[PDB]
């Protein structure tokens, strides 16, 4: 699987790497994919560029 995560800017480099690690871990545990076939992309956005549930920042 290829997991893309769109989040607000702000996290440190080490915290982003820990998040990628956790995504790999939960993917492996939930659907059984070998970490070696899990691909992750973290993409960071200004809050003004994101709207969830029709909400404006």
């Amino acid at each position: 699987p290829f997991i893309e995560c769109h989040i607000a800017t702000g996290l440190s480099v080490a915290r982003k790497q820990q998040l990628i690690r956790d995504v790999i871990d939960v993917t492996n545990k939930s659907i059984g994919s070998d970490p070696k076939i899990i691909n992750v992309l973290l993409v960071e956005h200004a809050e003004a560029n994101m709207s969830i549930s029709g909400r404006i920042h």
Partner: protein, 62 residues
């Protein structure tokens, strides 16, 4: 936040529900956003549509 997962057809509803629970949890933890603010979409396709370690995948067999 918005999360997408591209993978082959064939995972069960139970597996998808475990996957979403886990991803929402880790993204919630990292971003401080409540789970209700985290959209997730799974995008499924045939095996031929995926190239992993340089080779096209077979259709998934559970």
């Amino acid at each position: 936040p918005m999360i997408s997962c591209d993978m082959r057809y064939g995972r069960t509803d139970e597996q998808k529900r475990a996957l979403s629970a886990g991803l929402l949890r880790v993204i919630s933890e990292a971003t401080g956003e409540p789970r209700e603010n985290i959209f997730f979409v799974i995008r499924e396709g045939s095996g031929i549509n995926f190239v992993e370690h340089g080779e096209h995948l077979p259709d998934y067999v559970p």
